[PDB]
Design a protein around this ligand. Structure first.
Ligand SMILES: OC[C@H]1O[C@H](O[C@H]2[C@H](O)[C@@H](O)[C@@H](O)O[C@@H]2CO)[C@H](O)[C@@H](O)[C@@H]1O
Length: 421
């Protein structure tokens, strides 16, 4: 299980994990407390599995959308920064990591997708998605192409899908409507249909992934890609001369990327919660800690005000913020995981031709809604069970029963299930 007196951090392999390891070395030099940074594959799915057994990292980095799920399953410690420390970060970043009235992580940086373009191939990038076919056709005649980006992660296509009206979950009055997923409407279909038509008219390849799109852009073969701040670093070392700009408009509407707050949460099973708090508040979330990470791979717009004021001079960051403001902060509810799985499949199926746009999205809507409501019914069940298991062991089995207290909890659960059907 987790080791006492040591910090183990998990963070995604596309981030500045070597720079974070330098912050960890500084912590060790000051305190003698070893910090180890790992980037396991699919860490966002591995974390819940290992943490549920009380193993895993002391600190986990991911975008904020996954944290509500982790918190709801009891996998994260509550965090309680002093007022003085909170005021060092932008208030909207705290909002992203608030779940059920509690803070469940520290906000690190704001990530949004932008359009990245090769200035030598394309000194004026297109303002609209509708121009892309004609641009591509021209470029293919010269043995180049217009645009390549990662089709295998729905994060990258969502901005298009959402531009004319696709959504995830309704929000109103402090509550997400989990019965209703917005992935099957006219705007969602128009967006995805545009994408599939790019593929059908040979302007993109259906199995373009992160690495193929990254190699194609940084080797000068394609004129544009869609990516986050983390990717700028590899383009810097390539021979490509790039700019970063607002995503193209669709049906005259802004693309709407789903905006992530890269966040650090503390494993509820960690024996090192105080050391983790010290590391995060006094080493990572400082101008020099963020600089060391940023130097490795750009973080984006950082949550820390003092450092963001220096980063705001970078036009790449201004573009990141332009796109962020046109997009939307992701929800952090546990259902988000089901939303993404379902959109991932729909995109891949429609892009590869395994399903039509209309059947792919209809099926995503159905499966996301079912699992989302299912996760609520499961939470109602778990609450019944906690009440019953408590009552049965401490009351019934001790011969001190005069009725089952946990009947209304069951009926609420029963109603959830029977309504879902
Ligand atoms: O593709 C769905 C995926 O989107 C987001 O993951 C992003 C992440 O926020 C970024 O930091 C970056 O690393 O790329 C990921 C996409 O590959 C969501 O945060 C994630 O929950 C979801 O599965």
């Amino acid at each position: 299980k987790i080791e006492e007196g040591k910090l183990v951090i998990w963070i995604n392999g596309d981030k500045g994990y070597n720079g974070l390891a330098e912050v960890g070395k500084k912590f060790e030099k000051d305190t003698g407390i070893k910090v180890t940074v790992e980037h396991p594959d699919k860490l966002e799915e591995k974390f819940p599995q290992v943490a549920a057994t009380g193993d895993g990292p002391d600190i986990i980095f991911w975008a904020h959308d996954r944290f509500g799920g982790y918190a709801q399953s009891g996998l994260l410690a509550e965090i309680t920064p002093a007022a003085a420390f909170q005021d060092k970060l932008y208030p909207f970043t705290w909002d992203a990591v608030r779940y059920n009235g509690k803070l469940i992580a520290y906000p690190i940086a704001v990530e949004a997708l932008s359009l990245i373009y090769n200035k030598d191939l394309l000194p004026n990038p297109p303002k609209t998605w509708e121009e892309i076919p004609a641009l591509d056709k021209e470029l293919k005649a010269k043995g180049k192409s217009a645009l390549m980006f990662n089709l295998q992660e729905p994060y990258f296509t969502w901005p298009l899908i959402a531009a004319d009206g696709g959504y995830a979950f309704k929000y109103a009055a402090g509550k997400y409507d989990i019965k209703d997923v917005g992935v099957d409407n006219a705007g969602a279909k128009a967006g995805l249909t545009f994408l599939v038509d790019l593929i059908k008219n040979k302007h993109m390849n259906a199995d373009t992934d992160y690495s193929i799109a990254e190699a194609a852009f940084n080797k000068g073969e394609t004129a544009m890609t869609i990516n986050g701040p983390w990717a700028w670093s590899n383009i810097d070392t390539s021979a490509v001369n790039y700019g970063v700009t607002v995503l193209p408009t669709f049906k005259g509407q802004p693309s709407k990327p789903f905006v992530g707050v890269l966040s650090a949460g503390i494993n509820a099973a960690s024996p090192n919660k105080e050391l983790a708090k010290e590391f995060l508040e006094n080493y990572l979330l400082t101008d020099e800690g963020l600089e060391a990470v940023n130097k490795d791979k750009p973080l984006g717009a950082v949550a820390l005000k003092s450092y963001e004021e220096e980063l705001a001079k970078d036009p790449r960051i201004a573009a990141t913020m332009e796109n962020a403001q046109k997009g939307e902060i992701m929800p952090n509810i546990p259902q988000m995981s089901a939303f993404w799985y379902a959109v991932r499949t729909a995109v891949i199926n429609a892009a590869s031709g395994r399903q039509t746009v209309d059947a792919a999205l209809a099926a995503a809507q159905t499966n996301a809604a079912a699992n989302s409501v299912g996760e609520a019914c499961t939470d109602m069940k778990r609450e019944y069970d906690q009440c019953f298991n408590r009552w049965f062991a401490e009351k019934f089995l001790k011969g001190d029963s005069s009725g089952d207290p946990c009947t209304d909890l069951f009926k609420r659960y029963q109603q959830c299930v029977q309504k879902a059907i």
